[PDB]
A paper describes a structure:
pmcThe highly conserved major histocompatibility complex (MHC) related protein-1 molecule, MR1, can capture and present a range of small molecule metabolites to innate-like T cells known as mucosal-associated invariant T (MAIT) cells, as well as diverse MR1-reactive αβ and γδ T cells. The MAIT cell population is characterized by the expression of a semi-invariant αβ T cell receptor (TCR) where the α-chain is composed of TRAV1-2+TRAJ33/12/20+ in humans and of orthologous TRAV1+ TRAJ33+ in mice. Central to MAIT-MR1–mediated immunity is the recognition of the riboflavin-biosynthesis metabolite, 5-OP-RU, displayed by MR1 to a TCR on MAIT cells. Here, we determine the crystal structures of 2 mouse TRAV1-TRBV13-2+ MAIT TCR-MR1-5-OP-RU ternary complexes, whose TCRs differ only in the composition of their CDR3β loops.
To elucidate the molecular basis of mouse MAIT TCR-MR1 recognition and compare it to human MAIT TCR-MR1 recognition, we determined the crystal structures of the M2A and M2B mouse MAIT TCRs in complexes with mouse MR1-5-OP-RU to 3.4 Å and 3.45 Å resolution, respectively. Both mouse MAIT TCRs docked ∼88° to the main axis of the MR1-Ag–binding cleft, and the α- and β-chains were positioned atop the α2-and α1-helices of MR1, respectively. For both mouse TCR–MR1 complexes, 5-OP-RU bound within the A′ pocket of mouse MR1 via a covalent Schiff base with MR1-K43. Here, the ribityl moiety of 5-OP-RU is stabilized by polar interactions with mouse MR1 residues, namely R9, R94, Y152, and Q153. Both M2A and M2B mouse MAIT TRAV1+ CDR3α-Y95 formed a network of hydrogen bonds, the “interaction triad”, with the 2′-OH group of the ribityl tail of 5-OP-RU and Y52 of the MR1 α1-helix, known to be essential for MAIT activation. With respect to the Μ2A TCR, the CDR3α contributed the most to this interaction (25.6%), followed by the α-framework (FWα) region (12.6%), CDR2α (12.1%), and lastly, CDR1α (9.1%), while the CDR3β contributed ∼19.4%, followed by CDR2β (11.0%), FWβ (10.1%), and CDR1β (0.2%). In both mouse MAIT TCR-MR1-5-OP-RU ternary complexes, the TRBV13-2+ CDR2β Y50 residue forms hydrogen bonds with MR1-R61, and van der Waals (vdw) contacts with MR1-L65, while the CDR2β S54 residue binds MR1-R41. Despite the CDR3β loop of M2A having two additional amino acids than the M2B TCR, the amino acids are largely featureless in the M2A TCR CDR3β loop, where the main chain of residues, A96, L98, and G99 bind MR1. To examine how mouse TCRs can bind to MR1, we have analyzed two mouse MR1-5-OP-RU reactive MAIT TCRs; one from TRAV1 transgenic mice (paired with endogenous Vβ chain) and the other from WT mice, identified in the context of chronic H. pylori infection, named M2A and M2B, respectively.
Author numbering:
A (entry chain A): 1 to 192, 196 to 250, 253 to 270
B (entry chain D): 3 to 227, 229 to 243
C (entry chain C): 3 to 124, 129 to 137, 139 to 150, 152 to 191
D (entry chain B): -3 to 95
């Protein structure tokens, strides 16, 4: 397994509708937990197990930091657009976080992006920033001029970040470690025949579907649709195998220890 | 860099005291602390930008406002004796993250909130000539100046020998001894100046002990009898 | 959250390590500040990783697991006698300030001549000059004893320990055997 | 500056049943810049009850959003999802297929 905690930040130079000037959303195992934007100017929980375990003090201090960080982040976009002599709409993005893998080996990442492309990347082992263009090099030498910060980065990315994540995973362990089994059915879409094996409504987004020919032969001429989200917190997937009027296909589905074999007409 | 005004203040219980701060360092973060004997530095209010104002550990009875980027004033709507403390204004660059911040403190602001301003007494300076037993023994004069009977302790002793503020042989007492330990106690302070006897032999060397007293401002009420306003008191001395 | 000693003594020209022990929830850094009497705190060093920061005329060590750090001040002089504050950053980025350690430096005297003189007033104060281990005490009746002071006459290598005691009349005398009684 | 074409995927939250109420999704992903306009359609007309999720971030610096409207599938009514994005000079429309 693996668990991760990520905090993104976005800055646009045109606060249009449905896109604020500054956005910052935290994620745990690709699940929204926190949210902030210049329209609300308040940090809010994106999950119910976040609002019940985090005291109202945690939603009052980090707002102030985010309010300050909003001014800094929007300022950095202005400073970059000067170096590039850019005007109009441009995006400045940030990713920071850690992930706690199985076998204990933790990692730490922190990187920026300008207009979708990577701008500068931090190395917590070398205590240095990696530049992609000359403008990012001027940023590197300025950021690498305050050793108090680079050493602060390594501590958070390695020690502080994990402590939040382990604290966060214990919160909402009932939701983050839930188990809901799929509704698996098989259909028939004939040629202008293709059989479909679809599952619906499983929370743990790891499900295996293998379509078996005769009694024992894995059909290799198959198509796969990814685990799409549904909206209710569950996912869904499908797999197709173009058949032929042969004188026996079976779909094998396993999800969280519930193995199920289905016919195929 | 970071300065504070007023440098000293003597208020009455239930008055309007506004302690403002100004910075030249282009910093978005400014703070307001108070240093008391038992406790460490304790935050009162801070600000992460012009207009934003948040609360700290002790917002009780304190209000603050950041009109511009460079100014962050601490407003005391109703003054009370429990707010007597030395207040410090700080600054910090918000671009260095939130963890690596190096606070740049301004100098102190000695505030004193009294029930009745009639207890405000100005100091009395007395300059003592050296001993002949010192000159024959040490050949160094070691003069002494005493400033007694002032309240509050918002004073600053300084020596001015022949028009120049000497700082070589001056060890003024850091903490003024209270006259007698009973609340408002009219402290007295001592300071020693130790020059060579040759500097004492010449009668042309002019010695002086200057004590600056920060008391009641001119915008106060002293209709009873003295007017202990901010003044400089000194006693002169000449060689022998 | 942060605990700190309140006093430290060391000879002039020697060192002094000042300790700091925090119990914060998280930890994002440890900063030392120097505050000297009437002046305002001045930043000294910031430390967030384990190790020793050889800044030259001082050094900073940090132990994260133990939750402990000390500031190693070397080549001490009189001007370095001050109070030293350590502030730690919370897991929610709140500076937890310690109470501060008052470092006092002992002036090494190469000629201890304990002599008490009587200063005439131009009122008879008494001066106890040229006395480090000679500890003075505020003493006796309602009527005033000060504490030790160091004047550094920059014209020469003079650094004398002085003290002034006076009383409102009472027919006291400079030869009155005080409680310090160094003799 | 750099624009990534969005990925439109129209499907249903539950297995479709002609006559039974359901919900039709439109999962737009891998698009940048974040500014985007999404409209869902029914037989050509614009479905006015489109509810969009908050814009989410991705590790590859792209964004994804889930748009969904409750509906009732039949054997004749068609549905699609129109998306307007700066990466394209014209909006792209993807129709729903059930099979
Ligand atoms: C509150 C849970 C929101 N946090 C948040 C963060 N947190 C991490 C932040 O402390 C570090 O990035 C910082 O110490 C290093 O400079 N980061 C973020 O980007 N957005 C958030 O909303």
């Amino acid at each position: 397994r693996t668990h991760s905690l990520r905090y993104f930040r976005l800055a646009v130079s045109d606060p249009g509708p449905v896109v604020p000037e500054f956005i910052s959303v935290g994620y745990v195992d690709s699940h929204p937990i926190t949210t902030y934007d210049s329209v609300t100017r308040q940090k809010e929980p994106k999950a119910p197990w976040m609002a019940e375990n985090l005291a109202p003090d945690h939603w009052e201090r980090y707002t102030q930091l985010l309010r300050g960080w909003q001014q800094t982040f929007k300022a950095e976009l202005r400073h970059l657009q000067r170096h590039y002599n850019h005007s109009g709409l441009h995006t400045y993005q940030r990713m920071i976080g850690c992930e706690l893998l199985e076998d204990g080996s933790t990692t730490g990442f922190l990187q920026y992006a300008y207009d979708g492309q990577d701008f500068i990347i931090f190395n917590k082992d070398t205590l240095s920033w990696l530049a992609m263009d000359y403008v990012a090099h001027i940023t590197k030498q300025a950021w690498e001029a305050n050793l108090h910060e680079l050493q602060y980065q390594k501590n958070w990315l390695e020690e502080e970040c994990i402590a939040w994540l382990k604290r966060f995973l214990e919160y909402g362990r009932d939701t983050l470690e839930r188990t809901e089994h799929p509704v698996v059915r098989t259909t028939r879409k004939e040629t202008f025949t293709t059989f479909f094996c679809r599952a619906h409504g499983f929370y743990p987004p790891e499900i295996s579907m293998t379509w078996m020919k005769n009694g024992e032969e894995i059909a290799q001429e198959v198509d796969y649709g990814g685990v799409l989200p549904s909206g209710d917190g569950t996912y869904q997937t499908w797999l197709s195998v173009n058949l032929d009027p042969q004188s026996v296909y079976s779909c094998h589905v396993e999800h969280s220890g519930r193995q199920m074999v289905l016919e195929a007409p | 860099a970071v300065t504070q005004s007023p440098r000293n203040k003597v208020a009455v219980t239930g008055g309007k005291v506004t302690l403002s701060c100004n910075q030249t360092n282009n910093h978005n973060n400014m703070y307001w602390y108070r240093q008391d004997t038992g406790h460490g530095l304790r935050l009162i209010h801070y600000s992460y930008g012009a207009g934003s104002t948040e609360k700290g550990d002790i917002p009780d009875g304190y209000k603050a406002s950041r009109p511009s980027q460079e100014n962050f004033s601490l407003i005391l709507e109703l003054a009370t004796p429990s707010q007597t403390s030395v207040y410090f204004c700080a600054s910090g660059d918000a671009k260095l993250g939130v963890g690596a911040e190096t606070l740049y403190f301004g100098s102190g602001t000695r505030l004193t909130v009294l029930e009745d301003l009639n207890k405000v007494f100005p100091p009395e300076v007395a300059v003592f000539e050296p001993s002949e037993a010192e000159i024959s023994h040490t050949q160094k004069a070691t003069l002494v100046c005493l400033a007694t009977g002032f309240f509050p302790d918002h004073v600053e002793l300084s020596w001015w020998v022949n028009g120049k503020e000497v700082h070589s042989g001056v060890c003024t007492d850091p903490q003024p001894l209270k006259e007698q330990p009973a609340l408002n106690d009219s402290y007295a302070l001592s300071s020693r100046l130790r020059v060579s006897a040759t500097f004492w032999q010449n009668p042309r060397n002019h010695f002086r002990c200057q004590v600056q007293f920060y008391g009641l401002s001119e915008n106060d009420e002293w209709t009873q009898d003295a007017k202990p306003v901010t003044q400089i008191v000194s006693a002169e001395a000449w060689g022998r | 959250g942060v605990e700190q000693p309140a006093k430290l003594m060391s000879v002039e020209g020697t060192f002094a390590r000042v300790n700091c022990t925090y119990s914060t929830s998280g930890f994002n850094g440890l900063s030392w500040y120097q505050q000297r009497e009437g002046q305002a705190p001045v930043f000294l060093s910031y430390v967030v990783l384990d190790g020793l920061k050889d800044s030259g005329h001082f050094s900073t060590f940090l132990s994260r697991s133990n939750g402990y750090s000390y500031l190693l001040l070397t080549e001490l002089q009189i001007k370095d006698s001050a109070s030293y504050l350590c502030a730690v950053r919370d897991s929610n980025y709140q500076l937890i300030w310690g109470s501060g350690t008052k470092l006092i430096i002992k002036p090494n005297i190469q000629n201890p001549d304990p002599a008490v003189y009587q200063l005439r007033d131009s009122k008879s104060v008494c001066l106890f000059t040229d006395f480090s281990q000679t500890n003075v005490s505020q003493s006796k009746d309602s009527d005033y004893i000060t504490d030790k002071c160091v004047l550094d006459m920059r014209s020469m290598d003079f650094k004398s320990n002085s003290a002034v005691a006076w009383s409102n009349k009472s027919d006291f005398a400079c030869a009155n055997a005080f409680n310090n009684s160094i003799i | 500056a750099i624009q990534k074409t969005p990925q439109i995927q129209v499907y249903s939250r539950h297995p479709p049943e002609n006559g039974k109420p359901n919900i039709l999704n439109c999962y737009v992903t891998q698009f940048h810049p974040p500014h985007i306009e999404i409209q869902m359609l029914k037989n050509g007309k614009k479905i006015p009850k489109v509810e969009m999720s908050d814009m989410s971030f991705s590790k590859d610096w792209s964004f994804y959003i889930l748009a969904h409207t409750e509906f009732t599938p039949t054997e004749t009514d068609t549905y699609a999802c129109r998306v307007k994005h700066a990466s394209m000079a014209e909006p792209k429309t993807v129709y729903w297929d059930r099979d």
